[PDB]
Amino acid sequence: VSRTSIYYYAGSSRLLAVGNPYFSIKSPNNNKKVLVPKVSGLQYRVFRVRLPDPNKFGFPDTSFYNPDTQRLVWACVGLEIGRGQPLGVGVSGHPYLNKFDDTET
Amino acid sequence: KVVSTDEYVSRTSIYYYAGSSRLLAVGNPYFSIKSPNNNKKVLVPKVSGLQYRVFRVRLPDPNKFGFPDTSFYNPDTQRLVWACVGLEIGRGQPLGVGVSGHPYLNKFDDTETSNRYPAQPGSDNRECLSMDYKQTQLCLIGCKPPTGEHWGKGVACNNNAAATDCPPLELFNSIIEDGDMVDTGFGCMDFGTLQANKSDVPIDICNSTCKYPDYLKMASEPYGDSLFFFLRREQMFVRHFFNRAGKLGEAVPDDLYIKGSGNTAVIQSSAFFPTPSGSIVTSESQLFNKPYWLQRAQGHNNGICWGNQLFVTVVDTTRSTNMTLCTEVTKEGTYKNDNFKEYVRHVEEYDLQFVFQLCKITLTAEIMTYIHTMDSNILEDWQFGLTPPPSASLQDTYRFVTSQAITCQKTAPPKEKEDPLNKYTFWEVNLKEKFSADLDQFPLGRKFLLQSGL
Amino acid sequence: KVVSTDEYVSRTSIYYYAGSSRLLAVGNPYFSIKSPNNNKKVLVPKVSGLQYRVFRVRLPDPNKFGFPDTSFYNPDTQRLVWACVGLEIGRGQPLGVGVSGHPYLNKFDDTETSNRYPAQPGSDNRECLSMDYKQTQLCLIGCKPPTGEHWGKGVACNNNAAATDCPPLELFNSIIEDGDMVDTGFGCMDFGTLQANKSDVPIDICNSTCKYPDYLKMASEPYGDSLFFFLRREQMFVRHFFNRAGKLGEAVPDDLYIKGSGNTAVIQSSAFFPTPSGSIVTSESQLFNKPYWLQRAQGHNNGICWGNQLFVTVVDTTRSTNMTLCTEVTKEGTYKNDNFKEYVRHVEEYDLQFVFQLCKITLTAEIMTYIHTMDSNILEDWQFGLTPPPSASLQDTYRFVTSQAITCQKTAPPKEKEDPLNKYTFWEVNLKEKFSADLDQFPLGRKFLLQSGL
Numbered sequence A: 001v002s003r004t005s006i007y008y009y010a011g012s013s014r015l016l017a018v019g020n021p022y023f024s025i026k027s028p029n030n031n032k033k034v035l036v037p038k039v040s041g042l043q044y045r046v047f048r049v050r051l052p053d054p055n056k057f058g059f060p061d062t063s064f065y066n067p068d069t070q071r072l073v074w075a076c077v078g079l080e081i082g083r084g085q086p087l088g089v090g091v092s093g094h095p096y097l098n099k100f101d102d103t104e105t
Numbered sequence B, C: 001k002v003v004s005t006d007e008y009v010s011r012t013s014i015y016y017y018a019g020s021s022r023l024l025a026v027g028n029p030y031f032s033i034k035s036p037n038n039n040k041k042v043l044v045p046k047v048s049g050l051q052y053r054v055f056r057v058r059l060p061d062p063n064k065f066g067f068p069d070t071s072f073y074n075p076d077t078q079r080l081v082w083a084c085v086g087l088e089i090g091r092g093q094p095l096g097v098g099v100s101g102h103p104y105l106n107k108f109d110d111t112e113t114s115n116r117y118p119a120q121p122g123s124d125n126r127e128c129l130s131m132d133y134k135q136t137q138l139c140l141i142g143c144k145p146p147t148g149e150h151w152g153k154g155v156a157c158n159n160n161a162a163a164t165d166c167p168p169l170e171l172f173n174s175i176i177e178d179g180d181m182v183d184t185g186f187g188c189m190d191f192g193t194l195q196a197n198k199s200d201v202p203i204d205i206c207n208s209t210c211k212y213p214d215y216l217k218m219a220s221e222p223y224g225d226s227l228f229f230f231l232r233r234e235q236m237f238v239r240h241f242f243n244r245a246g247k248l249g250e251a252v253p254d255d256l257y258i259k260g261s262g263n264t265a266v267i268q269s270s271a272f273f274p275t276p277s278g279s280i281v282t283s284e285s286q287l288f289n290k291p292y293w294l295q296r297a298q299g300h301n302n303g304i305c306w307g308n309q310l311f312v313t314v315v316d317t318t319r320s321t322n323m324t325l326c327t328e329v330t331k332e333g334t335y336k337n338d339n340f341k342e343y344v345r346h347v348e349e350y351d352l353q354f355v356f357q358l359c360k361i362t363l364t365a366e367i368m369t370y371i372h373t374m375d376s377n378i379l380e381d382w383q384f385g386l387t388p389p390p391s392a393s394l395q396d397t398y399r400f401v402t403s404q405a406i407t408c409q410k411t412a413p414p415k416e417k418e419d420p421l422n423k424y425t426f427w428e429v430n431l432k433e434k435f436s437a438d439l440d441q442f443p444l445g446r447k448f449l450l451q452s453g454l
Helices: B215-219 B365-374 B443-451 C367-374 C445-449
Strands: A034-036 B015-019 B042-044 B055-057 B078-081 B100-105 B127-131 B135-140 B147-152 B170-175 B230-235 B237-243 B272-277 B323-326 B342-347 B353-357 B359-362 B427-429 C010-019 C042-044 C053-058 C080-089 C135-142 C147-152 C170-175 C231-235 C237-243 C272-277 C309-316 C323-328 C340-345 C352-360 C427-430
Touching: B015 B443, B147 B215, B353 B443, C053 C352, C080 C135, C080 C309
Parallel strands: B055 B427, C053 C427
Antiparallel strands: B015 B353, B078 B359, B100 B127, B135 B230, B147 B170, B237 B272, B323 B342, C010 C352, C053 C309, C080 C352, C135 C231, C135 C309, C147 C170, C237 C272, C323 C340
C-alpha cells in the first residue's frame, strides 16, 4: 500500500442522548414501542462510522491513478474523542438486595 | 445588456452518464379515495395519462466531486457547473387510448339529423355518456418550472349594471404542479367555480382546473429559464354534436328569424357543443424513445442548469388504456348479476436518461456582479463570498429521535432549506448516487460515442 | 477562508505594563439581604467561593496616545491595536475550604450499612444537613464573553398520545454573567424550574441556574476569539449515600425483583443521590500566583483584543472559608443561649497584572473588507468607514422658547445607546489611567526581562 499527500478532515455534530439510568420503559400496552430508553454511564457505547467511497470522488485523471488497475482506500492518522458533561459519579442499587448480616466488626 | 452564456462559461471534456431507474405509478384513473375515519388519509391516488408528470431532478454539487488537483482548477478563483447534452424519455408500456366520462352529463337532445318540433319537456335529463379526449404529446425541459395560463374569474365593477347576468372573465398565470390537468379540447378555464351544474365535463376535470402552457411568455423572458428544447403534436376531429339543456342566458333577437306558430311557436335552445375525438395513433409519430441532442438551445441559458436542478415535463395520451379488473362475491352454476364487483385501474411507466458535461466558469470582478443580478440565491449556495460565516458552528442532533418525551422536534423547522418551491408538489427522483465516469456500458453512452465519432 | 492573525498585522517592539489594584468584596455566603421597606435596597451582597468572578478590563485606546517618534505610525491608513503577551492573577487569602448546607434537606434514610425493614412512615421527615463541595479551579481569557450550557425545560409536545406525565429536558447556550453559581456534582441543571419542593440542593444553589463552560463549542468557533487560553483541575469522591422520600413516578418493573410477604409488603424507593466531597487541597497543586506567557493561542486570534477589552473569568474553591462573628446584647456573668446573635461572613481578594504590546495594522483595500464582515462595530470605532449626512439649512430656531406661539419642543435623544451588554452584571476594573512604559519598576516586568532573552 503506497501513501500519498492528500488529507481530509472530517467532523461530527455534537451527538447526545437522554434517558432513564436503570431500566427502559416500554409502552402500555404494546411491548414493541419504547418510551424512555435505558441509557447510563456504564454501557459500552459503540460508535459505528461510515465513510464515502473514494472510487466515486475524482473526475478521471490518468496521471493520478489508472482505474484499470489501481483502486483507493483510506487510512487513519488522528482521533479526538471529546466529552462534554461535567465530572462526577453516580450510584445505583436495589430495593431488595440480599444482605443477611454485617461481618466487618 | 443581457449576454448569452458562452461568454463567461467555458467548456471541457469530462462527460458523465446518469441513470434514473425504472419509475412506475399505479392508481385510480378517475379520482382519489380517502378513509372514512380521516379524509386526510389517502387510499388510492388519481393517476391517469392526462397529467403533467413533471419530474424535478437533483444533482450532486460539483465541488464535492474533487481532489486537491489545482493545476486543473484553483478552487478560490473558479467554480463548476453542469450542462445538459442529451435526453431520452422512455416509456415501456404498449399503446392504446382509454375513454372517460361522467354519469350525469347535461344533454338536451342531439343535433345531427332530426330535431322534430316540439321537444319533450322534463326536469332532469342528465345521462351517463362516455367520451374520449384530444390526442396530444409534448416534451419540455427547463432550469425553472414552466409557467402556464388559464382563464379565471376576477373582480367586477358594479357601477352601470345595465343588462347582463353573465360574469366576465380574466387571464391568470401560475406555475404548473404535477397532477394538474391538460386540455381536452374544451378551452382552458376553471371547472369548479364557473360551473354551477357540475355536469358538463367528465369526472376527471369535474372539480379541478386545467392549464395549458403559453410559449409566448416563457420564451420572451431575458434568460429563457423555462425552455431549452420543446416539441408539440396534437390532432383531433369532431364526431357528434349536442346542445345544452336549461335556461339560456341571452335570447337571440327576434328579427333574425320568422315567428313560428303552433308546435314551433315556442323557441328551442341553441347552446350547441361538440365532442372532441381522437384519430388513429401510429408508431411513426411518437415523440419518445429517441435521443435528442441539444446542440443549441433557443433562449440564452444554452445548457447551464443553475443551482443544480432542472425540470422535465412530459405528457402523453397514447399510452393510457384503462386497465380493467373484476372480482367475485358468491359462486354459482348458472350466471348471476350480483356475484361480481369490478374495478378500474391505470399504470403509467417511465424512464429518464441523461448525459452531462463538466463546465467551469471563472470568477472575476464583472462576472461576479453579473451573476449577482439574475438571481441572488445562486451565489449563496456556491459559498464564494463569505456573507454567511456561521455554518461551521456545530448543531446538536439526538439519539432516540421519535416518541420519547424528552423535548420533541416533530417537523417544526426554523427555516433550514427555504426553497420557494416547497409550497408546490412535484414527483421527485434523486440522482445523488448514480453517476458514472464511464459511458459505453450504458445505453446512451453507446449512442453518444457513435454520434460523436469517438 | 479565514486567515490567522500573523498575515495581516505586524508586531512593533515597545511593551507597556499595566496593573490593577487590590480588589475586595465582603458579604454573605448564602443569600443576599434586602431591605424590609424596599425590594431594591441590598444591604450585603451575595459573594461566596462558588461563583464565576468575571472581570472586565477596559484598556485605554492606542490612537489617543501621543508619541514623538512617529516613524512607525504613518497615520494615512494604519491604526494601532493592543496585543496581550502576559498575565498573572493573584489571590490573597489562606488555604481553607468552607461548607454549605440546607436546613430542610430531603434525607429520608441512609443506605450504606443497613436499611432494616419495615419503613418508618410519617408525612414529614426533612432535617438539616451539610456537605463540602466539589473543589475546582479554572481560568479563561477572551475578547468576547464566554458561553456555557445548562439543562432546562421546553415545549412538551402536542397532545396526541397518553403515555405518562413527565417533564422534558432541554439544554441552552447562554452567556456567563457574573454571579452564576458553578455546579458542584449535582449536574448542570436549572434548579429554579425543574425542581419543585426546593429542598434537595443546599441553600446557596437552590434558586440559581448552574452552568458549565462549553469547551466543546467555543473551541470550534470560526474566528476563535472567545478562548485564548484555559486551564482546569478538579477532583471529587463520594462520602455518604441517601435517598429521597416521595412517590417514585416511573415505577419499578416487577420482573426485576421477586416479591415478598409479611413485613416486606411495602416497597421502598430507588431514588438515590450521592453527596460529594473534596480531598485534601495541597499547595503544590495550586494554579494561580504564577505568570503565564502566551505564545500560541489555540484560536486564529493570536492575542489581538479588538474593541479594547478582555474578559478574565476566574473561579476558585480552595480559598472559600466562612468566617463567623458572634456578638451579644447583655453584659452577663454566666452563660446563656439567647444572649448572643451571630452573623457569618465571607471575604474575597484579587489582583491582576498584565503586559501588553502594541502592533500596527496596515490597511489596504483587501483587509478593510476582512475586518468589516467580522462585525461592523470594529470598523466604526476607528472612524475609517463613515457616511455623508445631508440636510444643509434647517428652520428651527426661535428667540423665545417659553411662550404662547409654542411648538412644544422635544429634545434629549437616547442616541448613545450602543452597548448590547447592559443586560448583565459584570465586575468592572478601569485600567485606563494606570499604564506605564518602564517595566523594570514593577513586579512582573522583572520576570519578563529575564525570560525574553534580554
